[PDB]
Each structure stands twice: as C-alpha cells, then as structure tokens.
Design an enzyme around this catalytic site. Structure first.
Site, mmCIF file in Angstrom:
data_model
loop_
_atom_site.group_PDB
_atom_site.id
_atom_site.type_symbol
_atom_site.label_atom_id
_atom_site.label_comp_id
_atom_site.label_asym_id
_atom_site.label_seq_id
_atom_site.Cartn_x
_atom_site.Cartn_y
_atom_site.Cartn_z
ATOM 1 N N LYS A 1 3.874 -7.156 -9.210
ATOM 2 C CA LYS A 1 4.023 -8.028 -10.376
ATOM 3 C C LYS A 1 2.957 -7.778 -11.447
ATOM 4 O O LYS A 1 2.338 -8.703 -11.973
ATOM 5 C CB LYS A 1 4.085 -9.497 -9.950
ATOM 6 N N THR A 2 2.752 -6.496 -11.773
ATOM 7 C CA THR A 2 1.791 -6.100 -12.795
ATOM 8 C C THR A 2 2.287 -4.991 -13.720
ATOM 9 O O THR A 2 1.581 -4.659 -14.681
ATOM 10 C CB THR A 2 0.466 -5.653 -12.153
ATOM 11 N N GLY A 3 3.466 -4.420 -13.477
ATOM 12 C CA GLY A 3 4.008 -3.360 -14.306
ATOM 13 C C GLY A 3 4.073 -1.988 -13.673
ATOM 14 O O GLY A 3 4.134 -0.995 -14.407
ATOM 15 N N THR A 4 4.050 -1.899 -12.338
ATOM 16 C CA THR A 4 4.085 -0.601 -11.668
ATOM 17 C C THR A 4 5.456 0.057 -11.765
ATOM 18 O O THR A 4 5.555 1.290 -11.780
ATOM 19 C CB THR A 4 3.665 -0.754 -10.206
ATOM 20 N N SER B 1 3.371 -15.088 -10.794
ATOM 21 C CA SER B 1 4.448 -14.114 -10.769
ATOM 22 C C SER B 1 4.825 -13.800 -9.328
ATOM 23 O O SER B 1 5.995 -13.555 -9.030
ATOM 24 C CB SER B 1 4.029 -12.857 -11.527
ATOM 25 N N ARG C 1 11.144 -11.270 -15.876
ATOM 26 C CA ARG C 1 11.559 -12.649 -15.635
ATOM 27 C C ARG C 1 10.884 -13.629 -16.592
ATOM 28 O O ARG C 1 9.689 -13.524 -16.883
ATOM 29 C CB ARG C 1 11.240 -13.025 -14.188
ATOM 30 N N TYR D 1 9.701 -17.453 -17.487
ATOM 31 C CA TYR D 1 9.284 -18.643 -16.764
ATOM 32 C C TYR D 1 8.403 -19.487 -17.677
ATOM 33 O O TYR D 1 7.754 -18.949 -18.583
ATOM 34 C CB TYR D 1 8.515 -18.268 -15.484
#
Ligand code: A3P
Ligand code: CA
Lengths: 102, 718
Positions: free
Chosen positions: B459-462, B557, B671, B673
C-alpha cells in the site's frame, strides 16, 4: 608384483633353534612391516622399517626377528623352542606359509 | 543473548577466519566488528562471550570503554577470550577434553584460566594461535565455561564412518583376502571402544568382477561377511548424477545396485547415500533426491560443497524434500590413492589429517561426523584401516565424549535437535562457483536470476512502479503466479525450502526472450526478518527498491486493504481502538495490529534490509512524488539502474483525472476513502514519532532522497 616366499622348518622336539627366511620378491623388505603370524593367526613378532622390534610375551625372551637389506630377506632367529610353537608361520606385509614341528 | 562479540583486526585476518570458522561450525552466534560500541541495549544482555583476536585490543582499549566493559562483566558475568603438551585433569572445563589467582588448563600453559580477583571475572587467554588441534579442543570448553554452559556442545558424539566406491577398481586397485579379513577384525576389535561401531560401505555392482583372480577372491569373501557390517547405497556404473537428467536412467542405475544389494545379502535398511564427487546435491537436483527416496528411501545424505567447497568449517546441513542432508568432510582419502606413497601429498599428508586435521575438526567442532574414503584405500596398502584406527584411538585418548556409532536416521535427527537454526537451508548462486557449475546439470541455463528487487511494503505504490517499469524496452518482468500473482513470496516465507530451481521457474529463459533483465514485486518482503539474509545469500548483486509514504495513511490503507480482502477484524473493529490496543485484547485484534501498525516502522525494516546489502543498491523513494510527478522519479530510478537506452517518461506518461496519479492501473491501488479522526491522528503522530525522527536521520544517513511527507510531518514535531 608383491610376492612373499618363506622357508625353514623342523627342530629338536625338546627344544632347539631355527632361522625362518622370508624373501620379499618384487618389492623392498625395508619398506613394509613383515610381521610374523603363527596359526587363528597370532602375530608373535614384527620388525619395522627402521628396525624396531615387537614381541608377544610368550616369545619375548626367546625369538629374535631380524632383517637383511642385501638379500631383501627378513629372518626369524628362533631360540629355545617350546612344544607350543608348532604352527604355520606367515610373514605378512601375506605369504604361502611354512610349518615348524617341535 | 549469547552473541559472541569478536574484535577482529581485519576481515581478511587468518586467526580471525579460524575463530569465526570454529564459531559457525559449532553454531556460536557472532557479529563481526573491527577492534576500536553499544555494550548493552536498553539494559539487557546483548553479549555473553567477548573474544579478542589480539590481546593488545583488550589491554589498550579506550578507558571509558574499558571501565564500561568491566562494569558489564561484573554486573552480567560474560566471558573474555584473548589470543596472544598434556591437559590438566583437575580443571572445571574438562567436559570435552580428556587428559592423556589463575589455574592452568594445558600444563605455565598456552591456554590459562583465571578465576577473577583483579577484575572479578573468569577469562581464558590463548598464548598460541589457532593451528594446533589441542588449542581448538580446549577452545570449545573455554567458550562453554566462560558462558556458564549456555554455549555448549552435547556429550553424545555421533560418528558415521562411511566408505564410498566399493567395487570400483579396474585391475590391481581393489581389495584382497588379507585386507578384507583385517577390515572385519578392525571393525570387531574396535567395537569395544565404541558401541556398535562399524564401517558403512558404498557399493557399486558394475565393477565387481573386473579385477584379477586374487582381487575377485577377496571380494567374494565379503558376501558371507555381511552379517556384521553396515553398507550404504551408491550407483552401479559410478557416474555422476547430473548427466542423468531423467528419473528412468538414474533410477535404473540405483535399481541395478538394489539388485546387487538383495543378491549378495546386503542390508538396505540404513538410509544413507553418496554420489561421486557430490554431484547434483548442491545445487539441489530434484532427480537425485526423488530417486533416493523413490528406490532407496534415503532420508539422510551428505554434501562437501555447502555453501562452497573451500573451506570445510563453513559447511552446513539442511532438510530438503524430507531428506536430512548433513555436511561431509573427507579425511583426505580420494579414489586416486593406491599405495602409501601414491597418496596425493605424501605419507605425511595423511598423518596430518590423523594427528589433528579435518578428521579431528569434524569430530570436535561438529557433534555429528560423516567421513569420505573409498575401496582403493582398503586394498593394496590399507590406508583407511591405519587412518581410522589411529583416529578412533586419538578420540578415546583425547575426548570424554561418550561416542556411539548408531544408524544414520537418529544421527541426522540429533544433528537437527542440536542445530535448530541449521534446519532451514540457504541457497546461493550456482554461476559464481565454477565447481558448483560443473556439479550442476548443463541442461539448464545460468542467467535466469533477476537484477532488481522490490521489497515493498504494501500500500505504497509498488504495483505502479512495477507496471511502469515493465513498459521499458530494456527492462522485463517475471511470470505472474496463480495465487500471489505479482508476488512470488519466496525469501520471506516457506517457499525458500523448495530449491533454487523453484525460483528459476518464475523467470523466463534468457535464450528464448531477448531481454535478460528481470524483476518481481514481492511487497511483503519489508515485514520480514529471514528475507534480507536469504536474498543476499542467493542474489548478492540484485539491487533493491523501496517506497515510503505516511505511516498513518499506510496503516489506514492496510486497514482498508483488509476491509477489501474480507477480513472481519477490520470490518468489526474501528481503527481508533486498533491504534490504542494493548495486552488485554483478542488474538485477531492483536494479529491485525501486528500486520497494520508493525510494518509502518520503516526504520527497523530498512535496518533489516540494509545490513545485508550495499548502500548503493538501496533506493528509497517518496510516494507523494509518485502521486504528483512520477516521471522525474522514474528518471532517478533510471539513473540508479543504469539502463542502456533511456526513454522519455514525460512523453509516455500523462495525468489521469479519474485515477489521481499520472498514468492503466488497477482499482486496488487507487481506492477512495474518507479521512481519519483528529484524536486518532494525534495518537498516530505520537505513536509514529520515534519512527519518523529515526527514519529522518536514517534516510539522511544513507545520503538519498529526503521525503516531502517526512519534511511535512517533521515540521509539526520539530
Ligand atoms: N503513482 C502512484 N500510482 C498509484 N498509487 C500510488 C502512486 N504513488 C503512491 N501511490 C499509493 O500507492 C498505494 C497502493 O500501493 P500498492 O501498489 O503497494 O498497493 C495507494 O494507496 P491507496 O490507493 O490505498 O490510497 C496510493 O496512495
Ligand atoms: Ca567416488
């Protein structure tokens, strides 16, 4: 080819002497152990490559193993022969074996 | 903790290599450091044994550090070892060695022992170096008594004398009548010293009748002499198993040896086997191991090349496919040894192994022993008889260890009860070692290893950096999995116990595909401890890549990641009590907290992934830069990678309004939120405070890109 040929036998049945000759054909007798084994097989003597000498306690005051580099033959100058000494004496680096009757 | 602190002068020191070699062969937990640190971590027992390679480092250290180690040694009781003939029987460390203000050990003495009056601590000073066998023999006891029996070796030694290549001679290099009878007599006369001690034999059936009349007469005498003798499986034609890439041909070779085994009354209930020159065992060939269990039920085997052949004190064992592999250490007896003078190295070379060589190291630093010798050292001159007889005479003349030669199954079981951390394997690259390349099969290729690593976290952009680096012409990706998909989950989980060839299945062949550069996105490698050491062991040149965002946003996240993955813990429990949960909580809530708040501490995980790799291989990237303008971040990753043809990412990528990032990409990485609670943000900022300032000096310490989010959340505190 390593071959070991032995000779010598018979003695005075109350007690005598012998010089069993074990000839080392095909190899050098000063490089191997050439320990004598009498019949199972019991190693009563040994003669090391530097000339060190070991006996069992039955033969320690009696037998004299020796070596000669010139004919490449290890000798067993036996002495004071008990009736228990009768056997097949095997010089082993095995050999054919020769019989002593005493 | 029983961490042995070693003060070595340099990494290439010979005495230091010998000390750490004894330490890993006896599994003493170490950490290498140059002699000048933090002696205690938060008032705990960081060290228990302090070994100095030079006594001048312990004598001429800094006064503050000297008084500090004196305070630590009096308060906690650690051992101090400092390196600058019979054994004394009245000694408290005579648990291994047997005799054939300070008190002597090797009676002054080269190895002394002080009770402690000047400094009030027990210490052992080695006057000589680590070259003689007696020094190592008392060194094990010195390590054990200086640690208070916390770093010891068990009394029960387990020796497994193995004899390979039976019936392998062509003509004139086999056994006879007298040497076979002397071998049976050597096994029975030495069975009073050690209970049920035998000579485990590795038979071959193809070269059984190639000898002369005198050689065949001695080999047929062993058939009725199988009543009291141990024999282990080998193969028929005596050829390496890496040439047999099929189960049929290798299984037929051992099946012919099985026919040879049941034909001459040879027992098959032992469970031990050896390949010639140890082929196909490390790198692990699935064919050899499966053929072993399929036709012979071999659960115990041996290896002379883990993790490399040179040296032998670094040798390990492992459990792969239900086979408890052990380390094999030869006694110098190879198949080229025919006579006493035909030995490689002369007659004094074998006596070097007997009077303190590999033989004594294998039975002393390792509680379990495996040996290597062949039929040719038992024929024409009886090399192994004299060698093993004088060896076992040396063991009862110099060790108190109740040694019993028992079957290999519980011998391997005892190896894994003693060594708990050696249960797991540690794979290496087969192309770095040319000997391992020759041992491994030539059917497979060599360049299937990747060159880029994506450790994560999630949840960091990998996935965005993974999919955006796959469109590059000089960069190629891997095959997607069925369950983990982009993840491979190899180094961090139990998938590492599947072999080196298991990892090569996910990458394409370098001959079929034009691009040779490969990578994989396994983002759960950040929250792991075993993964950096295993990744550095298998891939020492693979550069890593990690992206970091706000830990509150990353934790939320992960919270909504579990909410999208149907996890009921995130569905029922509100995030505000998850960040404030303590010891009085449920197991599911504690598990969700351990997977949500633990991997937001980027400092500890970068410390884990940083100690195993070079600082230039690491590249930390800010996530908000990937959200705003990612093309410039792709420019720095291209300069970090060093690609050949650099493409313009400013032209290829464009801003997408419905995605919110420049891009195309999945719904799971974009996503929507709502925000948090103010009290939740306040407690999350206070919880992640120490991690943020530690991450700030940690990222500034590496000399890399300082994050914008770190600068934004850092100004609120400082
Ligand atoms: N350029 C980018 N493209 C997509 N996601 C990015 C991004 N830069 C950062 N991210 C972040 O990456 C997260 C997903 O990372 P991962 O690929 O490891 O699952 C997203 O969290 P959210 O979508 O939950 O807000 C998003 O905030
Ligand atoms: Ca062999």
């Amino acid at each position: 080819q390593v071959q070991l040929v032995e000779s010598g036998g018979g003695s005075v049945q109350a007690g005598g002497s012998l010089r069993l000759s074990c000839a080392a054909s095909g190899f050098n007798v000063d490089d191997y152990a050439i320990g004598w084994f009498r019949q199972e097989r019991e190693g009563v003597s040994c003669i090391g490559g530097d000339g060190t000498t070991y006996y069992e306690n039955s033969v320690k005051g009696r037998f004299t193993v020796s070596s000669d580099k010139r004919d490449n033959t290890v000798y067993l100058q036996m002495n004071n022969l008990r009736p228990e000494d009768t056997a097949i004496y095997f010089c082993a680096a095995w050999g054919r074996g020769t019989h002593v009757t005493v | 903790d029983p961490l042995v602190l070693v003060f070595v002068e340099s990494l290439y020191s010979q005495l230091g290599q010998e000390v750490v070699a004894i330490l890993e062969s006896s599994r003493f937990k170490y950490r290498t450091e140059i002699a000048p640190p933090t002696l205690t971590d938060k008032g705990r027992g960081r060290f228990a044994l302090i070994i100095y390679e030079n006594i001048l480092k312990y004598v001429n250290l800094d006064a503050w550090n000297r008084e500090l180690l004196d305070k630590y040694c009096v308060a906690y009781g650690v051992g101090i070892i400092g390196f600058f003939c019979s054994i004394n029987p009245k000694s408290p460390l005579l648990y291994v060695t047997r005799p054939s203000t300070y008190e002597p050990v090797l009676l002054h003495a080269t190895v002394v022992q002080d009770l402690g009056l000047h400094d009030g601590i027990q210490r052992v000073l080695f006057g000589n170096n680590l070259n003689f066998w007696l020094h190592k023999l008392v060194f094990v006891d010195a390590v054990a008594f200086l640690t208070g029996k916390r770093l010891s070796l068990p009394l029960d030694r387990y020796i497994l004398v193995d004899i390979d290549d039976i019936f392998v001679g062509k003509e004139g290099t086999r056994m006879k009548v007298e040497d076979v009878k002397a071998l049976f007599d050597t096994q029975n006369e030495l069975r009073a010293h050690i209970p049920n001690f035998t000579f485990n034999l590795g038979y071959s059936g193809k070269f059984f009748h190639t000898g002369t009349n005198a050689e065949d007469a001695g080999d047929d005498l062993l058939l009725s002499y199988v009543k009291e003798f141990w024999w282990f499986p080998h193969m028929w034609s005596h050829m390496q198993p890496h040439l047999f890439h099929n189960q049929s041909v290798l299984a037929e070779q051992m099946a012919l040896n099985k026919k040879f085994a049941v034909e001459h009354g040879i027992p098959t209930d032992m469970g031990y086997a050896v390949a010639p020159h140890h082929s196909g065992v490390y790198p692990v060939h699935v064919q050899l191991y499966e053929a072993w269990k399929q036709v012979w039920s071999i659960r115990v085997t041996s290896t002379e090349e883990y993790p490399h052949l040179k040296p032998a004190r670094y040798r390990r064992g492992f459990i792969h496919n239900g086979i408890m592999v052990l380390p094999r250490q030869t006694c110098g007896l190879f198949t080229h040894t025919i006579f006493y003078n035909e030995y490689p190295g002369g007659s004094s070379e074998l006596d070097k192994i007997i009077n303190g060589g590999e033989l004594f190291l294998t039975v002393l630093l390792n509680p379990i022993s495996i040996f290597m010798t062949h039929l040719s050292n038992y024929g024409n001159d009886r090399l192994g008889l004299y060698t093993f007889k004088h060896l076992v005479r040396f063991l009862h003349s110099w060790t108190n260890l109740r040694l019993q030669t028992l079957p290999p199954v519980q011998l391997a079981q005892k190896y894994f009860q003693i060594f708990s951390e050696e249960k797991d394997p540690l794979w290496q690259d087969p192309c770095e070692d040319k000997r391992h390349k020759d041992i491994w099969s030539k059917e497979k290729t060599c360049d299937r290893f990747p060159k880029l690593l994506i450790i994560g976290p999630q949840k960091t952009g990998t996935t965005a950096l993974y999919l955006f680096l796959g469109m590059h012409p000089d960069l190629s990706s891997n095959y997607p999995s069925s369950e983990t998909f982009e993840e491979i989950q190899f180094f961090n989980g139990h998938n590492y116990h599947k072999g080196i060839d298991w990892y090569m299945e996910f990458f394409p062949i370098p001959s079929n595909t034009t691009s040779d550069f490969y990578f994989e996105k396994s983002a759960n490698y950040f929250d792991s401890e075993v993964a950096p050491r295993r990744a550095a062991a298998l891939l020492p040149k693979a550069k890593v890549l990690t992206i970091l965002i706000n830990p509150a946003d990353r934790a939320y996240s992960w919270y909504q990641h579990q909410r999208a993955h149907d996890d009921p813990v995130a569905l029922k429990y509100t995030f505000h009590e998850v960040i404030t949960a303590g010891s009085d909580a449920s197991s599911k809530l504690r598990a969700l907290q351990n997977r949500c708040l633990v991997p937001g501490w980027y400092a500890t995980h970068i410390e884990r992934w940083l100690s195993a790799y070079h600082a230039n291989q690491i590249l930390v990237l800010d996530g908000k830069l990937l959200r705003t303008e990612p093309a410039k971040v792709m420019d720095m990753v291209q300069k970090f990678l060093g690609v050949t043809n650099t493409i313009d990412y400013h032209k290829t990528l464009a801003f997408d309004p419905k995605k919110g990032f420049w891009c195309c990409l999945g719904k799971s990485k974009g996503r929507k939120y709502p925000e948090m609670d103010l009290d939740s943000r306040a407690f999350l900022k206070d919880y992640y405070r120490d991690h943020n300032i530690e991450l700030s000096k940690l990222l500034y310490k590496m000399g890399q890109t300082l994050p914008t989010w770190l600068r934004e959340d850092l100004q609120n505190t400082r």
